Design a protein around this ligand. Structure first.
Ligand code: Z1B
Ligand code: CL
Ligand code: ZN
Length: 194
């Protein structure tokens, strides 16, 4: 037990992304135990933590999504107390918590662009060439440590719409050359499933 806690956020707003920390380790541990977090949710991407891992969560279609390998079946701390997951799919590595009515959320990409942008937990905005529904190649190889903690973050198109959620890196001898992600169409199938 213990809730996932929002510890920071990434603001995309104007041409350059920036990360903002909102909670330190002590406040995080306290918040995880109660599940009560009075902070209002802002920004396009949330930086979230459990007692052992930090990763990202992204709101799309009014649901805050993240990876199961980070969140497990945990609740998320909120102003109204711990929020139980609305969606849980171990096979897709996907978790979603319903966000409050009218909260800011990304909309799906329908433009078919293959020019994607991955937002990391350090607010780096990396170009990615789409290769299939759930894969994209990096334009520069990166050490795997550069992407650690970015699972749950968004892949965006040039119009700033959501293409998917970052899940895993294609890693060979510590070098990431491509990314594996959960496409927004798959999040929508999860939302439409009873
Ligand atoms: C359907 O496709 C998938 C694909 C991957 C899944 C998964 O991946 C695991 C988790 C993921 C990962 O480690 N994600 C990183 C980002 C990465 F760039 F480093 C992350 O931020 N999360 S974390 O674990 O560090 C935690 C937050 C701090 N993996 C990988 O990135 C691996 N690559 C990989 O698996 O590539 C394939 C898919 C091409 C084979 C390595 C570690 C070698 C780089 C292996 C883990 C799980 C999973 C689900 C539920 C419970 C437990 C595990 N399901 C997956 C389903
Ligand atoms: Cl679009
Ligand atoms: Zn688009």
């Amino acid at each position: 037990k213990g809730s996932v806690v929002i510890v920071g956020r990434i603001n995309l707003s104007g041409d350059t992304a920036y990360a903002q920390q909102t909670r330190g380790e002590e406040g995080c541990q306290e918040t995880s135990q109660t599940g009560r977090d009075k902070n209002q949710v802002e920004g396009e991407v949330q930086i979230v933590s459990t007692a052992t891992q930090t990763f990202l969560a992204t709101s799309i279609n009014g649901v805050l999504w993240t990876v199961y390998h980070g969140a497990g079946t945990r609740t998320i701390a909120s102003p109204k107390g711990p929020v139980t997951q609305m969606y849980t799919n171990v096979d897709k590595d996907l978790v979603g918590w319903q966000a409050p009515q009218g909260s800011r959320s990304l909309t799906p990409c329908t433009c078919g662009s293959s020019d994607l942008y991955l937002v990391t937990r350090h607010a780096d905005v990396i170009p990615v060439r789409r290769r299939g529904d759930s894969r994209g190649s990096l334009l520069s190889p990166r050490p795997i440590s550069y992407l650690k903690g970015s699972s749950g973050g968004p892949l965006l198109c040039p119009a700033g719409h959501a293409v998917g959620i970052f899940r895993a890196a294609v890693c060979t001898r510590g070098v990431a050359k491509a990314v594996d992600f959960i496409p927004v169409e798959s999040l929508e199938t999860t939302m439409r499933s009873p």
